[PDB]
Design a binder for these strands. Sequence first.
DNA 1: CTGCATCCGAGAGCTGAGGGAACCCAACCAT
DNA 2: ATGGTTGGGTATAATGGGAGTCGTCTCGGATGCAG
Lengths: 47, 53, 260
Amino acid sequence: KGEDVPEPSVPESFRVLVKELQALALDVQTLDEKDNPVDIFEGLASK
Amino acid sequence: EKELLEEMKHPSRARRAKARKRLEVVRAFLDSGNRPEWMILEAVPVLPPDLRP
Amino acid sequence: TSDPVRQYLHEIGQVPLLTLEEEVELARKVEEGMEAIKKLSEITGLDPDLIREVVRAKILGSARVLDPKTVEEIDQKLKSLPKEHKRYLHIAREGEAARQHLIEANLRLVVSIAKKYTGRGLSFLDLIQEGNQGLIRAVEKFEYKRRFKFSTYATWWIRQAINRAIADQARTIRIPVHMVETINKLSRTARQLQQELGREPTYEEIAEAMGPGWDAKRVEETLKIAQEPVSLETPIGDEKDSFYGDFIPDEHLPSPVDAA
DNA sequence: CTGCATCCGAGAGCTGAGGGAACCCAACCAT
DNA sequence: ATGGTTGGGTATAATGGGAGTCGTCTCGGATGCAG
């Protein structure tokens, strides 16, 4: 369309890594500056 | 932790090293808030199917 | 320490075998314990299976984890019953103990039968466990009044359990038992036809050799559904760097061109 | 009681390219 | 209302498995020896 490319996002391989670490019963959680959880899965994996 | 801290006063160097090694794990659990019994599994997680296609 | 087969063999070998007197004695005990269970069920008016479970729980003891409260309430709900018609409960306890002994003593026949079923998709220990299940069923159903030896009735149940487990669990994609039998019959027929012809038979020859209701197309479908999936981790090439799944493209998610 | 001393086991060894075996019988949900 | 699927059954006697692998190097627990 002639514009410039946007800013990138989280790669899918890191999501695969997080899921594979959860399968080993390890809780991997991404946090912001205030130590609060940051959901990298866009609310598609939260009950 | 109190017992191991008391043990860490022995003149023996090997005893002190063993107490320190146990204290490392004890203090890691105490600091993290993890429960030791969580090292035994009751429910086994199952990977999403698209990653085991 | 390791090699669980040796550990299991050692634990089974620690239990001595049985003579005719002991085997017939235990079988008679089991039968009278079941009859006593039914008599006590009639006396109290309750369901027989639940009282059977209370007897089993009391024999197995606290060591084995229906809850302690319920079983305790019914346990004292039975102690209240007066003499002469109480023996039944003791006979039931004895019979359940006899059942446990009988199974423990006949565990070795399960191994003897199961040792000739290796290489069909189930490990040795799984076959042994399924044979143990069949042995428990045979113990429950055994009738000593017919004067037959226990192993004669036990072998059939052990074989049935092993065969059913093999048909049920050997494949990643589950295939029904009748279809599994059809596949086995097809393979055996093809092997006999190859032995006779001196070469791999064609599908029409196999269809003719199966009987009425079989054409080459049906044989083709049966061979198609009998194919087992391959591993995504199958190594390609000599070096340990290339897997099969590395050569499979994703056809589900839209491509950048498609999204645009 | 300590210490050191072999002893055992566990975790490694460059990138890129190309490489592919029983049978039968009867009831019961699904379509 | 039909096929496909599933649970149950067989009664001389049977009673402890089987493939395998010896041509590598370095470092941190540990049992064993002495004092």
